[PDB]
Amino acid sequence: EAEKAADESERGMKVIESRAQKDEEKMEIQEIQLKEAKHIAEDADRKYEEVARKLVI
Amino acid sequence: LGTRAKESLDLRAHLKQVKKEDIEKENREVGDWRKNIDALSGMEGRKKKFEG
């Protein structure tokens, strides 16, 4: 019984290992995506200030 | 964003504390008792009385 339980416990441990690795991958991908998002946001902000200036004039 | 994240972090911190630190209250129950052997030493009786 103990040896079978050891096999299953290692099974579960390895499954959680793999899932955590996949999650880290998705985390870094979303991280680079978020940086790109921030840059797009700043660009839009600058464009907005510019067009406001033009309209006032 | 940091405030919302820290709210959930603090909320789960106390739950983790209660779940985990309280385990340290006792963990020796895994330890089994003696379960000693006889080694052919407890053969010191005849078929005289059996009810008692």
Binding site: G12 | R12, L15, V18, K19, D22, I23, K25, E29, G52
Partner: protein, 371 residues
């Protein structure tokens, strides 16, 4: 001093001192009087073997559980079980220890009042408190939200909780549980020739159910596969030899959980009463309940249930929500671990029903502020 976290349950009594990881003594809750005559004189034959002693002499006893469906139907036997639990399995006199019983939701009041009256008059404890069996299972998971499905052996109940505020109008209690699955397995085994009738052989059928049965991911495909190949037939050795071979009875016994029409019950399975319990909640906490579905209780230990239930709920639920099913490996003792955690809290130390309070208001104190 330390508190006694008892947990009556129905099928296994689990007890132990507050602050540990696992219950100290776990033993079936059966009291069996002998039924034959008895010819040896002076053998020291008792009149009732309780607990784990009656699972070894079960060949000449008539075991009878004192708790049918959560409720207690035979108070003398339950008192005997409690006396055994306190004095022989823990060996601590109750005069010096608070107790924390557990009770299923939506149970009759008289049961709870009689329980507190017994604990205060017969065993004479200093203070006792009764807690709902699902909140503890939520404690043990370390969460504070989530909808917990506590499929015990007596009764399956489904209590949703958000941010610590229980929703009393969304509790769905269903009386299908492990015992009905044992009876149904014992009833479908007769299709191969094996007849178990005696109340002692119900224990053998229970062992078969525990060791062999599993929940199928898809029912029709398994029914088709088991009817063509023979890769499922697992054999099992009775307590006297004569091995038996279980075919498609393996996944048909626990399938009753998701189709209670098998045992003639009208209601919907445990896969749809959870979704109904969620939909009764408010529209803004449904995402959190979807993401934090908790399993507990013994009967949720079938191999492959955490996937079947997730598949079913994902079929029912809207496609955008994420469905996650928390199935900790320590499922069986989840309620008791939560009970230990709750009894070990400092904030909880003033919620006990002190004896002087009971003396002033009678047993009806339990329904009052001290819940």
């Amino acid at each position: 001093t330390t508190a006694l976290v008892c947990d009556n349950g129905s099928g296994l009594v689990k007890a132990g001192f507050a602050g540990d990881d696992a219950p100290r003594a776990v033993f079936p809750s059966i009291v069996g009087r002998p039924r034959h005559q008895g010819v040896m004189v002076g053998m020291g034959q008792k009149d009732s073997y309780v607990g784990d002693e009656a699972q070894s002499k079960r060949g000449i006893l008539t075991l009878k559980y004192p708790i049918e469906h959560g409720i207690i139907t035979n108070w003398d036997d339950m008192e005997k079980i409690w006396h055994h639990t306190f004095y022989n399995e823990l060996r601590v006199a109750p005069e010096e220890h608070p107790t924390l019983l557990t009770e299923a939701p939506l149970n009759p009041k008289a049961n709870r009042e009689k329980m507190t009256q017994i604990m205060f008059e017969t065993f004479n404890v200093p203070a006792m408190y009764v807690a709902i069996q699902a909140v503890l299972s939520l404690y043990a998971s370390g969460r504070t939200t989530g909808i917990v499905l506590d499929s015990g052996d007596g009764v399956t109940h489904n209590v949703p909780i958000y941010e610590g505020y229980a929703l009393p109008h969304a509790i769905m209690r269903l009386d299908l549980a492990g015992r009905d699955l044992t009876d149904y397995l014992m009833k479908i085994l007769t299709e191969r020739g094996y007849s178990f009738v005696t109340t002692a052989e119900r224990e053998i059928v229970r062992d078969i159910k525990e060791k062999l049965c599993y929940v199928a991911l898809d029912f029709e495909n398994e029914m088709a596969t088991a009817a063509s190949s023979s890769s499922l037939e697992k054999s099992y050795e009775l307590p006297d030899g004569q091995v038996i071979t279980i075919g498609n009875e393996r996944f048909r016994c626990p399938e009753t959980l998701f189709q209670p029409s098998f045992i003639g019950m009208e209601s919907a399975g445990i896969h749809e009463t959870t979704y109904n319990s969620i939909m009764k909640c408010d529209i803004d906490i449904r995402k959190d309940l979807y993401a934090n579905n908790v399993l507990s209780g013994g009967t949720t230990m079938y191999p492959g249930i955490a996937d079947r239930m997730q598949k079913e709920i994902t079929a029912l639920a809207p496609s955008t929500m994420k469905i996650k099913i928390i199935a900790p490996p320590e499922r069986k003792y989840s309620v008791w671990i939560g009970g230990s955690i709750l009894a070990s809290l400092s904030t909880f130390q003033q919620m006990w029903i002190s004896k002087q309070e009971y003396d002033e208001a009678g047993p009806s104190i339990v329904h009052r502020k001290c819940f």
